[PDB]
Amino acid sequence: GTSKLKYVLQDARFFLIKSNNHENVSLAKAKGVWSTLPVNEKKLNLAFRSARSVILIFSVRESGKFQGFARLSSESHHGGSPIHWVLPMLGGVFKIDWICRRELPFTKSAHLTNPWNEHKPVKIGRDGQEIELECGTQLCLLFPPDESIDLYQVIHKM
C-alpha cells in the first residue's frame, strides 16, 4: 500500500542527488549513509532541522533513471569508519533510511516539472537541487513499491 508512504512524505522536503557512479549509490543502499560536498551538506543540515522528513532522490548520471529514495535520519557527522566512496573534500556523513531501493526511468517522470529549477523536468538538476513539495511527492509516488521495506520503523523516527 501507499498510505504509510504518503504519511512519511507529508510536508517533507526533497533534494535531488546526482551521483557520478553506481558504486556510490550501491554503497549508500548497503550502508545507509550518504556524503556530499560542503555546500550541499550545509543545505541538508538546515533542512533536517526544519522539516519532519528530508528525502533524497538518487540518480546516477548517464543512467537515465532514478535509483531510489531515502530519508535523512541524522544531520551530518564526522569521525566514523571511512566509507570507500569512488571519488571524482567531502563533508560529514548523513545516516539515511531507504524508503525505496527500486529504479524509476526518466521516461516515467516526464510530466513532473520542478518549480525550483525553472520548471524543468524533475530529472534535470544539479546535485543538491531542492525539489518543490508537490513535484517531489508525486515523483516518489511514481516509484514501484519496495515490498522489502517496512515504513513502521521510519515513522517511529518522526
Three-state DSSP string of 33-66: EECCCHHHHHHHHHHHHHCCCEEEEEEECCCCEE
123 annotated as belonging to a binding site for a ligand: no
35 annotated as belonging to a binding site for a ligand: yes
Distance between CA atoms of 117 and 125, rounded to whole angstroms? 7
Distance between CA atoms of 65 and 139, rounded to whole angstroms? 12
Residues 33 and 144 sit within 8 Å (Cβ to Cβ): no
34 annotated as belonging to a binding site for a ligand: yes
CATH number at residue 124: 3.10.590.10
Instruction: Provide the domain limits for residue 98.
Output: 1-158
20 annotated as belonging to a binding site for a ligand: yes
Distance between CA atoms of 135 and 14, rounded to whole angstroms? 9
Partnered with residue 16 across adjacent β-strands are: 57
26 annotated as belonging to a binding site for a ligand: no
Q: How many CB atoms lie within 10 A of CB 10?
A: 12
Number of domains in the chain: 1
